[model samples]
Target: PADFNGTWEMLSNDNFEDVMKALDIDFATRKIAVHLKQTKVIVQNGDKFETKTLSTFRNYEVNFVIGEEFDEQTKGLDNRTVKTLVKWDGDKLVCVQKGEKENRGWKQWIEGDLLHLEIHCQDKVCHQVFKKKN
Candidate 1:
Protein backbone atom coordinates (compact mmCIF):
# COMPACT_ATOMS: atom_id res chain seq x y z
CA PRO A 1 0.00 0.00 0.00
CA ALA A 2 3.01 2.27 0.27
CA ASP A 3 9.04 4.19 -0.80
CA PHE A 4 11.64 7.11 -1.04
CA ASN A 5 11.54 5.40 -4.44
CA GLY A 6 11.56 1.84 -3.07
CA THR A 7 10.03 0.25 0.02
CA TRP A 8 11.81 -0.28 3.31
CA GLU A 9 10.75 -2.83 5.90
CA MET A 10 11.42 -2.92 9.62
CA LEU A 11 14.53 -4.60 10.87
CA SER A 12 14.16 -3.92 14.58
CA ASN A 13 11.82 -1.97 16.83
CA ASP A 14 13.26 -1.26 20.24
CA ASN A 15 10.83 -0.68 23.10
CA PHE A 16 7.93 0.55 20.98
CA GLU A 17 5.67 -0.45 23.86
CA ASP A 18 6.77 2.45 26.00
CA VAL A 19 5.87 4.95 23.28
CA MET A 20 2.52 3.25 22.72
CA LYS A 21 1.87 3.14 26.43
CA ALA A 22 2.63 6.81 26.69
CA LEU A 23 0.09 7.47 23.95
CA ASP A 24 -2.57 5.75 26.08
CA ILE A 25 -3.20 3.15 23.41
CA ASP A 26 -5.25 0.13 24.40
CA PHE A 27 -3.44 -2.11 26.83
CA ALA A 28 -3.91 -5.26 24.80
CA THR A 29 -3.16 -3.60 21.50
CA ARG A 30 -0.07 -2.04 22.96
CA LYS A 31 1.26 -5.48 23.71
CA ILE A 32 0.28 -6.78 20.32
CA ALA A 33 1.55 -3.71 18.59
CA VAL A 34 5.06 -3.89 19.96
CA HIS A 35 5.89 -7.03 18.04
CA LEU A 36 3.87 -6.24 14.97
CA LYS A 37 5.76 -6.16 11.69
CA GLN A 38 5.98 -2.70 10.14
CA THR A 39 6.86 -1.57 6.68
CA LYS A 40 7.40 2.10 5.95
CA VAL A 41 7.35 3.44 2.44
CA ILE A 42 8.68 6.89 1.72
CA VAL A 43 7.85 8.55 -1.59
CA GLN A 44 9.96 11.65 -1.35
CA ASN A 45 10.14 13.75 -4.46
CA GLY A 46 12.16 16.78 -3.51
CA ASP A 47 10.13 18.65 -0.82
CA LYS A 48 6.88 16.79 -1.40
CA PHE A 49 6.61 13.51 0.50
CA GLU A 50 4.32 10.58 1.09
CA THR A 51 4.86 8.22 4.00
CA LYS A 52 3.19 5.07 5.16
CA THR A 53 3.47 2.67 8.08
CA LEU A 54 1.92 -0.64 7.20
CA SER A 55 1.49 -3.76 9.32
CA THR A 56 -0.55 -6.89 9.05
CA PHE A 57 -3.38 -5.63 11.19
CA ARG A 58 -3.40 -1.93 10.49
CA ASN A 59 -1.85 0.74 8.32
CA TYR A 60 -1.16 4.45 8.65
CA GLU A 61 -0.41 7.01 5.95
CA VAL A 62 0.54 10.67 5.69
CA ASN A 63 1.51 13.07 2.91
CA PHE A 64 3.21 16.45 3.12
CA VAL A 65 5.58 19.05 1.75
CA ILE A 66 8.66 20.18 3.56
CA GLY A 67 8.00 22.90 6.16
CA GLU A 68 4.30 22.86 5.30
CA GLU A 69 1.96 21.87 8.11
CA PHE A 70 -0.84 19.37 7.64
CA ASP A 71 -3.55 17.91 9.81
CA GLU A 72 -2.59 14.50 11.10
CA GLN A 73 -5.20 12.22 12.58
CA THR A 74 -4.04 9.21 14.55
CA LYS A 75 -7.40 8.14 15.84
CA GLY A 76 -6.89 4.41 16.37
CA LEU A 77 -3.27 4.97 17.34
CA ASP A 78 -4.47 7.20 20.23
CA ASN A 79 -6.39 10.06 18.82
CA ARG A 80 -3.48 12.35 18.34
CA THR A 81 -5.27 14.47 15.77
CA VAL A 82 -2.45 16.90 15.28
CA LYS A 83 -0.96 19.59 13.20
CA THR A 84 2.24 18.09 11.84
CA LEU A 85 5.09 19.55 9.88
CA VAL A 86 8.24 18.02 8.44
CA LYS A 87 11.64 19.57 7.93
CA TRP A 88 15.11 18.55 6.94
CA ASP A 89 17.80 18.87 9.57
CA GLY A 90 21.14 17.77 8.23
CA ASP A 91 20.24 14.60 6.33
CA LYS A 92 17.34 13.61 8.53
CA LEU A 93 13.66 14.36 8.27
CA VAL A 94 12.32 15.69 11.55
CA CYS A 95 8.70 16.10 12.40
CA VAL A 96 6.67 17.04 15.45
CA GLN A 97 2.99 16.35 15.76
CA LYS A 98 1.32 18.80 18.08
CA GLY A 99 -2.28 18.43 19.09
CA GLU A 100 -3.69 18.06 22.58
CA LYS A 101 -0.78 15.67 23.04
CA GLU A 102 2.10 17.96 22.23
CA ASN A 103 4.97 15.57 22.71
CA ARG A 104 4.61 13.33 19.68
CA GLY A 105 7.35 13.37 17.11
CA TRP A 106 9.82 11.39 14.99
CA LYS A 107 13.16 11.64 13.26
CA GLN A 108 13.89 9.65 10.12
CA TRP A 109 17.08 9.26 8.15
CA ILE A 110 18.97 6.88 5.98
CA GLU A 111 22.30 5.78 7.33
CA GLY A 112 24.26 3.76 4.81
CA ASP A 113 21.98 0.85 3.91
CA LEU A 114 19.67 1.26 6.89
CA LEU A 115 16.92 3.65 7.73
CA HIS A 116 16.69 4.90 11.29
CA LEU A 117 13.39 6.05 12.68
CA GLU A 118 13.09 7.45 16.16
CA ILE A 119 9.60 7.76 17.56
CA HIS A 120 8.68 9.88 20.56
CA CYS A 121 5.58 10.22 22.70
CA GLN A 122 5.16 11.87 26.05
CA ASP A 123 8.50 11.19 27.70
CA LYS A 124 9.07 7.86 25.97
CA VAL A 125 11.07 7.25 22.86
CA CYS A 126 11.59 4.22 20.61
CA HIS A 127 14.11 3.39 17.93
CA GLN A 128 13.02 1.49 14.86
CA VAL A 129 15.37 0.48 12.10
CA PHE A 130 14.53 -0.57 8.58
CA LYS A 131 16.23 -2.13 5.60
CA LYS A 132 15.59 -1.44 1.97
CA LYS A 133 13.40 -3.98 0.25
CA ASN A 134 15.44 -6.69 -1.40
Candidate 2:
Protein backbone atom coordinates (compact mmCIF):
# COMPACT_ATOMS: atom_id res chain seq x y z
CA PRO A 1 0.00 0.00 0.00
CA ALA A 2 1.03 3.57 -0.57
CA ASP A 3 1.94 5.36 2.66
CA PHE A 4 0.77 8.96 2.95
CA ASN A 5 1.22 9.83 6.59
CA GLY A 6 3.24 13.00 6.84
CA THR A 7 3.22 16.78 6.72
CA TRP A 8 3.95 18.38 3.39
CA GLU A 9 4.83 21.98 2.72
CA MET A 10 3.78 23.68 -0.48
CA LEU A 11 6.55 24.24 -2.98
CA SER A 12 4.49 25.81 -5.75
CA ASN A 13 1.07 26.09 -7.26
CA ASP A 14 0.28 26.39 -10.98
CA ASN A 15 -2.84 28.05 -12.43
CA PHE A 16 -4.57 28.20 -9.05
CA GLU A 17 -6.26 31.41 -10.10
CA ASP A 18 -8.02 29.61 -12.91
CA VAL A 19 -9.34 27.03 -10.49
CA MET A 20 -10.57 29.70 -8.06
CA LYS A 21 -12.31 31.42 -10.95
CA ALA A 22 -13.94 28.20 -12.01
CA LEU A 23 -15.25 27.67 -8.47
CA ASP A 24 -16.82 31.13 -8.58
CA ILE A 25 -14.72 32.30 -5.69
CA ASP A 26 -14.93 35.95 -4.81
CA PHE A 27 -12.25 38.35 -5.92
CA ALA A 28 -11.08 39.14 -2.40
CA THR A 29 -10.75 35.49 -1.43
CA ARG A 30 -9.05 34.65 -4.70
CA LYS A 31 -6.46 37.30 -4.11
CA ILE A 32 -5.58 35.88 -0.73
CA ALA A 33 -5.76 32.22 -1.73
CA VAL A 34 -3.49 32.64 -4.70
CA HIS A 35 -0.65 33.90 -2.57
CA LEU A 36 -1.01 31.81 0.58
CA LYS A 37 1.49 29.04 1.21
CA GLN A 38 -0.76 26.04 1.65
CA THR A 39 0.27 23.01 3.66
CA LYS A 40 -1.09 19.49 3.77
CA VAL A 41 -1.26 17.08 6.69
CA ILE A 42 -2.38 13.57 5.96
CA VAL A 43 -2.88 10.69 8.38
CA GLN A 44 -3.48 7.36 6.73
CA ASN A 45 -4.65 4.43 8.86
CA GLY A 46 -5.40 1.43 6.77
CA ASP A 47 -8.30 2.35 4.44
CA LYS A 48 -9.24 5.51 6.30
CA PHE A 49 -7.56 8.86 5.80
CA GLU A 50 -7.65 12.21 7.51
CA THR A 51 -6.54 15.10 5.33
CA LYS A 52 -6.12 18.75 6.11
CA THR A 53 -5.25 21.66 3.84
CA LEU A 54 -3.85 24.41 5.96
CA SER A 55 -3.09 28.03 5.31
CA THR A 56 -2.77 31.22 7.24
CA PHE A 57 -6.20 32.61 6.33
CA ARG A 58 -8.35 29.58 5.73
CA ASN A 59 -8.14 25.87 6.30
CA TYR A 60 -10.02 22.89 4.89
CA GLU A 61 -10.31 19.45 6.36
CA VAL A 62 -11.93 16.27 5.12
CA ASN A 63 -11.95 12.70 6.32
CA PHE A 64 -12.99 9.70 4.29
CA VAL A 65 -12.64 5.99 3.88
CA ILE A 66 -11.59 4.34 0.70
CA GLY A 67 -14.48 3.19 -1.52
CA GLU A 68 -17.11 4.82 0.70
CA GLU A 69 -19.22 7.66 -0.64
CA PHE A 70 -20.37 10.41 1.71
CA ASP A 71 -21.85 13.88 1.69
CA GLU A 72 -19.08 16.42 1.90
CA GLN A 73 -19.66 20.07 2.55
CA THR A 74 -16.63 22.03 1.56
CA LYS A 75 -16.33 24.65 4.23
CA GLY A 76 -14.07 27.71 3.96
CA LEU A 77 -13.43 26.87 0.30
CA ASP A 78 -16.36 27.36 -2.11
CA ASN A 79 -18.82 26.41 0.68
CA ARG A 80 -20.65 23.83 -1.38
CA THR A 81 -21.96 20.37 -0.77
CA VAL A 82 -20.99 17.35 -2.81
CA LYS A 83 -20.91 13.59 -2.75
CA THR A 84 -17.31 12.64 -2.39
CA LEU A 85 -15.65 9.31 -2.94
CA VAL A 86 -11.97 8.49 -2.72
CA LYS A 87 -10.42 5.46 -4.32
CA TRP A 88 -7.07 4.09 -5.25
CA ASP A 89 -5.86 4.00 -8.82
CA GLY A 90 -2.64 2.07 -8.70
CA ASP A 91 -0.50 3.98 -6.20
CA LYS A 92 -2.32 7.23 -6.85
CA LEU A 93 -5.27 8.34 -4.76
CA VAL A 94 -8.17 9.62 -6.86
CA CYS A 95 -11.13 11.59 -5.56
CA VAL A 96 -14.47 12.15 -7.31
CA GLN A 97 -16.68 14.92 -6.06
CA LYS A 98 -20.16 15.01 -7.61
CA GLY A 99 -22.06 18.23 -7.33
CA GLU A 100 -23.31 21.22 -9.29
CA LYS A 101 -20.05 21.64 -11.15
CA GLU A 102 -18.90 19.29 -13.85
CA ASN A 103 -15.51 17.59 -13.86
CA ARG A 104 -14.76 18.42 -10.28
CA GLY A 105 -12.26 16.25 -8.47
CA TRP A 106 -8.68 15.82 -7.38
CA LYS A 107 -5.89 13.28 -7.60
CA GLN A 108 -2.85 12.83 -5.37
CA TRP A 109 0.37 10.98 -5.83
CA ILE A 110 3.87 10.79 -4.48
CA GLU A 111 7.07 11.02 -6.50
CA GLY A 112 10.10 10.17 -4.42
CA ASP A 113 9.91 12.67 -1.55
CA LEU A 114 7.57 15.03 -3.39
CA LEU A 115 3.81 15.02 -3.06
CA HIS A 116 1.73 16.18 -6.00
CA LEU A 117 -1.87 17.28 -6.06
CA GLU A 118 -4.03 17.95 -9.09
CA ILE A 119 -7.24 19.81 -8.40
CA HIS A 120 -9.72 20.27 -11.23
CA CYS A 121 -12.93 22.18 -11.68
CA GLN A 122 -14.80 22.58 -14.94
CA ASP A 123 -12.01 22.97 -17.47
CA LYS A 124 -9.54 24.46 -15.03
CA VAL A 125 -6.73 22.46 -13.49
CA CYS A 126 -4.39 23.47 -10.70
CA HIS A 127 -1.22 21.59 -9.99
CA GLN A 128 0.30 21.91 -6.52
CA VAL A 129 3.53 20.34 -5.41
CA PHE A 130 4.69 19.81 -1.86
CA LYS A 131 7.81 18.48 -0.22
CA LYS A 132 7.56 15.99 2.60
CA LYS A 133 8.69 17.39 5.94
CA ASN A 134 8.02 14.33 8.09
Candidate 3:
Protein backbone atom coordinates (compact mmCIF):
# COMPACT_ATOMS: atom_id res chain seq x y z
CA PRO A 1 0.00 0.00 0.00
CA ALA A 2 1.07 3.54 -0.82
CA ASP A 3 -0.41 4.80 2.42
CA PHE A 4 1.47 7.63 4.11
CA ASN A 5 0.53 7.61 7.75
CA GLY A 6 3.25 8.17 10.32
CA THR A 7 5.98 10.46 11.52
CA TRP A 8 9.10 11.01 9.41
CA GLU A 9 12.36 12.55 10.57
CA MET A 10 14.39 14.68 8.22
CA LEU A 11 17.66 13.15 7.12
CA SER A 12 18.86 15.90 4.81
CA ASN A 13 17.74 18.95 2.86
CA ASP A 14 19.35 20.45 -0.22
CA ASN A 15 19.00 24.03 -1.53
CA PHE A 16 16.09 24.87 0.72
CA GLU A 17 17.07 28.53 0.71
CA ASP A 18 16.68 28.71 -3.05
CA VAL A 19 13.17 27.36 -2.81
CA MET A 20 12.36 29.80 0.00
CA LYS A 21 13.76 32.70 -1.99
CA ALA A 22 11.74 31.67 -5.01
CA LEU A 23 8.61 31.74 -2.85
CA ASP A 24 9.45 35.26 -1.75
CA ILE A 25 9.87 34.30 1.86
CA ASP A 26 11.10 37.10 4.09
CA PHE A 27 14.74 37.38 5.01
CA ALA A 28 14.04 36.78 8.69
CA THR A 29 11.85 33.81 8.02
CA ARG A 30 14.24 32.32 5.48
CA LYS A 31 17.10 32.68 7.88
CA ILE A 32 15.24 30.77 10.54
CA ALA A 33 13.56 28.25 8.23
CA VAL A 34 16.71 27.33 6.33
CA HIS A 35 18.46 26.32 9.51
CA LEU A 36 15.58 24.43 11.07
CA LYS A 37 15.32 20.69 10.66
CA GLN A 38 11.90 19.79 9.28
CA THR A 39 9.85 16.75 10.14
CA LYS A 40 6.75 15.50 8.34
CA VAL A 41 3.69 13.87 9.87
CA ILE A 42 1.06 12.52 7.53
CA VAL A 43 -2.29 10.97 8.40
CA GLN A 44 -4.17 9.53 5.45
CA ASN A 45 -7.60 8.02 5.35
CA GLY A 46 -7.99 6.48 1.94
CA ASP A 47 -8.39 9.47 -0.38
CA LYS A 48 -8.40 12.04 2.38
CA PHE A 49 -5.13 13.21 3.88
CA GLU A 50 -3.81 15.52 6.56
CA THR A 51 -0.19 16.60 6.61
CA LYS A 52 2.03 18.57 8.91
CA THR A 53 5.46 19.98 8.25
CA LEU A 54 6.98 20.61 11.63
CA SER A 55 9.87 22.78 12.71
CA THR A 56 10.90 24.86 15.69
CA PHE A 57 10.37 28.14 13.86
CA ARG A 58 7.07 27.25 12.16
CA ASN A 59 4.65 24.44 11.63
CA TYR A 60 2.54 24.04 8.47
CA GLU A 61 -0.54 21.90 8.10
CA VAL A 62 -2.48 21.03 4.92
CA ASN A 63 -5.65 18.97 4.74
CA PHE A 64 -7.12 17.77 1.45
CA VAL A 65 -8.70 14.97 -0.50
CA ILE A 66 -7.32 13.29 -3.54
CA GLY A 67 -8.13 14.88 -6.91
CA GLU A 68 -9.77 17.85 -5.20
CA GLU A 69 -8.53 21.42 -5.17
CA PHE A 70 -8.54 23.62 -2.09
CA ASP A 71 -7.21 26.94 -0.89
CA GLU A 72 -3.92 26.22 0.88
CA GLN A 73 -2.92 28.88 3.32
CA THR A 74 0.83 28.69 3.72
CA LYS A 75 0.79 30.56 7.00
CA GLY A 76 4.07 29.59 8.59
CA LEU A 77 6.16 29.56 5.40
CA ASP A 78 4.92 32.33 3.09
CA ASN A 79 1.62 33.56 4.57
CA ARG A 80 0.04 33.28 1.12
CA THR A 81 -2.94 31.30 -0.04
CA VAL A 82 -2.86 29.19 -3.17
CA LYS A 83 -5.04 26.79 -5.08
CA THR A 84 -3.61 23.36 -4.27
CA LEU A 85 -4.42 20.00 -5.76
CA VAL A 86 -2.87 16.72 -4.64
CA LYS A 87 -3.11 13.40 -6.38
CA TRP A 88 -1.42 10.07 -6.83
CA ASP A 89 1.26 9.26 -9.36
CA GLY A 90 1.48 5.53 -8.82
CA ASP A 91 3.13 5.04 -5.45
CA LYS A 92 4.06 8.68 -5.13
CA LEU A 93 1.99 11.57 -3.79
CA VAL A 94 2.03 14.63 -6.03
CA CYS A 95 0.85 18.15 -5.40
CA VAL A 96 0.41 21.12 -7.76
CA GLN A 97 -0.05 24.55 -6.26
CA LYS A 98 -1.28 27.39 -8.44
CA GLY A 99 -0.15 30.89 -7.58
CA GLU A 100 2.04 33.65 -8.96
CA LYS A 101 4.94 31.23 -9.04
CA GLU A 102 5.20 28.83 -11.98
CA ASN A 103 5.45 25.07 -11.55
CA ARG A 104 5.04 25.20 -7.80
CA GLY A 105 4.53 21.74 -6.43
CA TRP A 106 5.95 18.85 -4.42
CA LYS A 107 6.15 15.10 -4.60
CA GLN A 108 6.46 12.46 -1.87
CA TRP A 109 7.71 9.02 -2.65
CA ILE A 110 8.72 6.30 -0.24
CA GLU A 111 11.29 3.61 -0.82
CA GLY A 112 11.35 1.14 2.06
CA ASP A 113 11.62 3.37 5.12
CA LEU A 114 13.13 6.25 3.19
CA LEU A 115 10.91 9.09 1.99
CA HIS A 116 11.92 11.53 -0.70
CA LEU A 117 10.32 14.95 -0.88
CA GLU A 118 11.01 17.26 -3.76
CA ILE A 119 9.80 20.84 -3.73
CA HIS A 120 9.95 22.89 -6.89
CA CYS A 121 9.25 26.52 -7.68
CA GLN A 122 9.97 28.06 -11.05
CA ASP A 123 13.35 26.60 -12.05
CA LYS A 124 14.59 26.00 -8.51
CA VAL A 125 14.12 22.65 -6.88
CA CYS A 126 14.73 21.53 -3.31
CA HIS A 127 15.25 17.96 -2.28
CA GLN A 128 14.64 16.55 1.20
CA VAL A 129 14.99 13.06 2.51
CA PHE A 130 13.09 11.75 5.54
CA LYS A 131 13.22 8.46 7.34
CA LYS A 132 10.15 6.83 8.78
CA LYS A 133 9.82 6.94 12.54
CA ASN A 134 7.02 4.48 12.76
Candidate 4:
Protein backbone atom coordinates (compact mmCIF):
# COMPACT_ATOMS: atom_id res chain seq x y z
CA PRO A 1 0.00 0.00 0.00
CA ALA A 2 1.77 3.08 -1.29
CA ASP A 3 5.24 1.67 -0.61
CA PHE A 4 5.29 1.71 3.19
CA ASN A 5 8.56 -0.13 2.87
CA GLY A 6 10.83 2.07 4.88
CA THR A 7 11.87 2.98 8.39
CA TRP A 8 9.48 4.94 10.59
CA GLU A 9 10.22 6.62 13.90
CA MET A 10 7.59 6.89 16.59
CA LEU A 11 6.40 10.40 17.36
CA SER A 12 3.46 10.03 19.74
CA ASN A 13 1.28 7.40 21.32
CA ASP A 14 -2.38 7.78 22.23
CA ASN A 15 -4.21 5.42 24.59
CA PHE A 16 -1.56 2.77 24.06
CA GLU A 17 -1.78 1.44 27.59
CA ASP A 18 -5.37 0.40 27.21
CA VAL A 19 -4.47 -2.03 24.46
CA MET A 20 -1.57 -3.41 26.41
CA LYS A 21 -3.50 -3.56 29.66
CA ALA A 22 -6.34 -5.29 27.88
CA LEU A 23 -3.84 -7.93 26.86
CA ASP A 24 -2.73 -8.16 30.46
CA ILE A 25 0.62 -6.64 29.68
CA ASP A 26 2.39 -6.17 32.97
CA PHE A 27 3.62 -2.97 34.57
CA ALA A 28 7.03 -3.56 33.06
CA THR A 29 5.57 -3.43 29.58
CA ARG A 30 3.78 -0.18 30.29
CA LYS A 31 6.85 1.34 31.84
CA ILE A 32 9.03 0.25 28.99
CA ALA A 33 6.71 1.71 26.38
CA VAL A 34 6.68 5.18 27.83
CA HIS A 35 10.44 5.43 27.42
CA LEU A 36 10.68 3.45 24.24
CA LYS A 37 11.67 4.93 20.95
CA GLN A 38 10.05 2.55 18.53
CA THR A 39 11.17 2.17 14.95
CA LYS A 40 9.19 0.21 12.44
CA VAL A 41 10.92 -1.30 9.46
CA ILE A 42 8.79 -2.69 6.70
CA VAL A 43 10.22 -4.60 3.78
CA GLN A 44 8.06 -5.64 0.93
CA ASN A 45 9.07 -8.04 -1.84
CA GLY A 46 6.30 -8.92 -4.20
CA ASP A 47 3.55 -10.51 -2.06
CA LYS A 48 5.85 -11.46 0.82
CA PHE A 49 6.88 -9.01 3.47
CA GLU A 50 8.75 -8.56 6.72
CA THR A 51 7.72 -6.18 9.48
CA LYS A 52 9.85 -5.32 12.45
CA THR A 53 9.01 -3.30 15.53
CA LEU A 54 12.16 -2.16 17.22
CA SER A 55 12.69 -0.54 20.61
CA THR A 56 15.55 0.00 22.94
CA PHE A 57 14.64 -2.99 25.09
CA ARG A 58 13.24 -5.44 22.58
CA ASN A 59 12.28 -6.07 19.02
CA TYR A 60 9.31 -7.80 17.41
CA GLU A 61 9.49 -9.20 13.90
CA VAL A 62 6.88 -10.81 11.71
CA ASN A 63 7.05 -12.26 8.21
CA PHE A 64 4.04 -12.93 6.08
CA VAL A 65 2.66 -13.14 2.59
CA ILE A 66 -0.38 -11.40 1.32
CA GLY A 67 -3.63 -13.42 1.59
CA GLU A 68 -1.74 -16.10 3.48
CA GLU A 69 -2.88 -16.84 7.01
CA PHE A 70 -0.44 -17.59 9.79
CA ASP A 71 -0.28 -18.01 13.55
CA GLU A 72 1.16 -15.24 15.67
CA GLN A 73 2.44 -15.88 19.17
CA THR A 74 2.56 -12.56 20.93
CA LYS A 75 5.01 -14.00 23.43
CA GLY A 76 6.59 -10.83 24.72
CA LEU A 77 3.23 -9.16 25.17
CA ASP A 78 0.30 -11.21 26.48
CA ASN A 79 1.71 -14.61 25.51
CA ARG A 80 -1.53 -15.44 23.81
CA THR A 81 -1.46 -16.92 20.30
CA VAL A 82 -3.61 -15.98 17.38
CA LYS A 83 -4.05 -16.57 13.67
CA THR A 84 -3.52 -13.49 11.53
CA LEU A 85 -4.00 -12.44 7.96
CA VAL A 86 -3.07 -9.24 6.19
CA LYS A 87 -4.38 -7.50 3.11
CA TRP A 88 -4.53 -4.13 1.49
CA ASP A 89 -7.58 -1.93 1.65
CA GLY A 90 -7.10 0.77 -0.88
CA ASP A 91 -3.85 2.36 0.26
CA LYS A 92 -4.20 1.15 3.82
CA LEU A 93 -2.57 -1.92 5.30
CA VAL A 94 -5.18 -3.98 7.12
CA CYS A 95 -4.80 -6.98 9.37
CA VAL A 96 -7.14 -9.41 11.11
CA GLN A 97 -5.96 -11.46 14.04
CA LYS A 98 -8.34 -14.17 15.18
CA GLY A 99 -8.22 -15.74 18.61
CA GLU A 100 -9.90 -15.66 21.99
CA LYS A 101 -9.59 -11.90 21.90
CA GLU A 102 -12.30 -10.07 20.02
CA ASN A 103 -11.59 -7.50 17.31
CA ARG A 104 -7.83 -7.56 17.46
CA GLY A 105 -5.38 -6.35 14.83
CA TRP A 106 -3.89 -3.23 13.31
CA LYS A 107 -3.99 -0.87 10.38
CA GLN A 108 -1.21 1.24 8.90
CA TRP A 109 -1.33 4.10 6.45
CA ILE A 110 0.70 7.00 5.21
CA GLU A 111 -0.33 10.64 5.19
CA GLY A 112 2.14 13.11 3.71
CA ASP A 113 5.33 12.62 5.72
CA LEU A 114 3.49 10.99 8.60
CA LEU A 115 2.68 7.39 9.28
CA HIS A 116 -0.45 6.43 11.19
CA LEU A 117 -0.96 3.11 12.87
CA GLU A 118 -3.99 1.99 14.82
CA ILE A 119 -3.70 -1.05 17.04
CA HIS A 120 -6.79 -2.73 18.46
CA CYS A 121 -7.35 -5.49 20.96
CA GLN A 122 -10.45 -6.52 22.85
CA ASP A 123 -12.39 -3.24 23.03
CA LYS A 124 -9.41 -0.96 23.42
CA VAL A 125 -7.69 0.88 20.61
CA CYS A 126 -4.33 2.61 20.46
CA HIS A 127 -3.13 5.18 17.99
CA GLN A 128 0.52 5.54 17.14
CA VAL A 129 2.12 8.22 15.01
CA PHE A 130 5.40 8.05 13.17
CA LYS A 131 7.36 10.32 10.91
CA LYS A 132 9.17 9.49 7.76
CA LYS A 133 12.91 9.43 7.97
CA ASN A 134 13.88 12.40 5.88
* All candidates: TM-score: 0.92, 0.98, 0.95, 0.93
Clashing pairs in 2: none
Candidate 3 on 1-134: residue-level lDDT in tens?
Answer: 77689999999999899999999997887788878888999998999998899998778888999999999888877777789999899989899999878999999899888889999999999999999997
Backbone collisions counted per model: 3, 0, 0, 0
Candidate 3 lDDT (Cα, 0 to 1): 0.90
Choose the strongest candidate by lDDT: 2
* lDDT (10s digit) by residue, model 4, range 1-134: 47777889999999888998887888787888757889989887867889888888878988899899999998767778899999988888899999988999999889988889999998899999998883
Q: How many clashes would you count in candidate 4?
A: 0
lDDT of each: 0.84, 0.95, 0.90, 0.87
Which one wins by lDDT: 1 or 3?
3
TM-score, predicted candidate 3 vs. hidden true structure: 0.95
After superposition, candidate 1 runs with Cα above 4 Å error: 1-3
Q: Name the best candidate (by TM-score).
A: 2
Query: Global CA lDDT of candidate 4, please?
Result: 0.87
Off by over 4 Å in 4: none
Q: For residue 48, what is the lDDT in candidate 2? A: 95
| RMSD of candidate 2 to true structure, Å | 0.7
Question: Which of candidates 2 and 3 is the stronger one according to lDDT?
Answer: 2
lDDT score of residue 30 within candidate 1: 86
Mind sharing the TM-score for model 2?
Answer: 0.98
